[PDB]
A paper describes a structure:
[name] and KAT6B are members of the [name] family of acetyltransferases, a group of transcriptional regulators implicated in cellular proliferation and development. The hallmark of this family, which includes KAT5, [name], KAT6B, KAT7, and KAT8 (also known as Tip60, [name], MORF, HBO1, and MOF, respectively), is the [name] acetyltransferase domain (herein referred to as the [name] domain) that employs acetyl-CoA to catalyze acetylation of lysine residues within the histone tails of the nucleosome. [name] forms a 4-protein complex with BRPF1, ING4/5, and MEAF6 to acetylate H3K23. We show that the [name] domain and KAT6AFL preferentially acetylate [name], with this selectivity linked to a glycine pair preceding K14.
While our efforts to obtain crystallographic data for this complex were unsuccessful, we were able to solve a crystal structure of the [name] domain bound to a [name]-CoA bisubstrate inhibitor. Such peptide-CoA conjugates have been utilized to interrogate the binding sites of acetyltransferases so we evaluated how [name]-CoA, which consists of H3 (5-23) with the ε-amino group of K14 covalently attached to CoA through a non-native acetyl bridge, is bound to the [name] [name] domain. The structure of the [name] [name] domain with [name]-CoA was solved at 1.72 Å resolution, with interpretable electron density observed for residues 10 to 17 of the H3 peptide, the CoA moiety, and the acetyl bridge between the [name] ε-amino group and CoA. Comparing this structure with prior crystallographic models of the [name] [name] domain bound to acetyl-CoA and NuA4 complexed with a Htz1 peptide indicates that the CoA and peptide portions of the [name]-CoA bisubstrate inhibitor largely overlap with acetyl-CoA and the Htz1 peptide, respectively. This observation implies that the bisubstrate inhibitor occupies both the acetyl-CoA and peptide binding sites of the [name] [name] domain, as expected. The structure shows the peptide portion of the bisubstrate inhibitor surrounded by three loops within the [name] domain: α2-β7, β8-β9, and α3-α4. Within this crevice, the bound peptide assumes a β-turn, resembling a type I conformation based on dihedral angles (ϕ, ψ) of G13 (−90.1°, −6.9°) and K14 (−118.1°, 5.3°). In addition, we note that the α-carbon atoms G12 and G13 are in proximity (3.3–5.0 Å) to several residues within the α2-β7 (autoacetylated K604, L606, and F613), β8-β9 (E635, S645, and C646), and α3-α4 (E680) loops. Steric restrictions within this environment provide a model for the preferred acetylation of lysine residues adjacent to a GG pair given the small size and conformational flexibility of glycine. The peptide portion of the bisubstrate inhibitor is stabilized by several putative hydrogen bonds, including 8 water-mediated contacts and 8 direct contacts with the [name] [name] domain.
Residue numbers in the entry:
A (entry chain A): 507 to 782
B (entry chain C): 10 to 17
Amino acid sequence: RCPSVIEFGKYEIHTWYSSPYPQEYSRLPKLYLCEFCLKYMKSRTILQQHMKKCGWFHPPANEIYRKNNISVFEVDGNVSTIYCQNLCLLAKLFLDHKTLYYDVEPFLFYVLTQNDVKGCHLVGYFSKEKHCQQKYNVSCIMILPQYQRKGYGRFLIDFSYLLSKREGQAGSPEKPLSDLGRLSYMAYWKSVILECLYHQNDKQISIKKLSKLTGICPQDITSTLHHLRMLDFRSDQFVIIRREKLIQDHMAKLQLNLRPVDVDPECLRWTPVIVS
Amino acid sequence: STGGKAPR
Ligand SMILES: *C(=O)CSCCNC(=O)CCNC(=O)[C@H](O)C(C)(C)COP(=O)(O)OP(=O)(O)OC[C@H]1O[C@@H](n2cnc3c(N)ncnc32)[C@H](O)[C@@H]1OP(=O)(O)O
Ligand SMILES: [Zn+2]
């Protein structure tokens, strides 16, 4: 509703929700955003003038991940504060339940970009609390509309699990999950569990073992196994019943429909480690 | 502390 449209790089995009841009820009219907620094401006002329002075061609942070034309930048809210507050204002136009936009200092923002000769273009991001008592491995996650349904959301979800698993603790997305989040996370969990069971043939695996190998918390694995119809209960606790054709057919579909956008652990420049 | 979807 307010603003209703934004210009961002080579696209004009309809907003889904209101975001609290400053009073002067609040009642403005269309905002012009710089695609590199995320500064909000009132007109195309002001944007064109800004683009001549703007020195950034990628987010103001170091590249934690790079493979082919894809990068992830680890942006610290306590360091690139203005950029992160501008990113939060941008994300609120597409996340109805994101409430944090100003106190960004306790958060990290993993900004995903698709790169070409004009720079590192922002595709989306996920934020995470540096220290979360609930072990939420993602606070908010958003892929811009023109980049949705291309495997970027799965990439970022998988990246979030790579970090929380390398730091030895299972995590889960912060709730509530949007409708798209519910579909996306379940598809991720299902694909991960199925590919994990395929590679662990010689092991009567358990929810606990699946949780350690994947970083997915036990309750989310339990829900996923319930969705896959691989749970049974006789007496004390759930037993996993493998549905072999479900496992074997998923792996066959994966071998023909490759995952072109896929997190390669060897392409992280720095990875978490539990300190001695 | 409180996250980005923390009810306000
Ligand atoms: C709090 O922040 C957590 S919940 C809110 C986060 N997202 C949100 O609502 C903001 C707007 N949406 C997004 O940013 C975006 O849609 C995501 C991040 C929710 C999902 O990312 P992608 O759009 O890039 O998803 P993909 O990685 O391409 O898809 C993975 C699988 O998810 C299922 N899926 C996704 N969109 C679907 C729709 N519209 N309908 C059905 N199923 C959908 C699919 O299984 C998809 O895999 P496919 O192989 O089928 O493509
Ligand atoms: Zn700029």
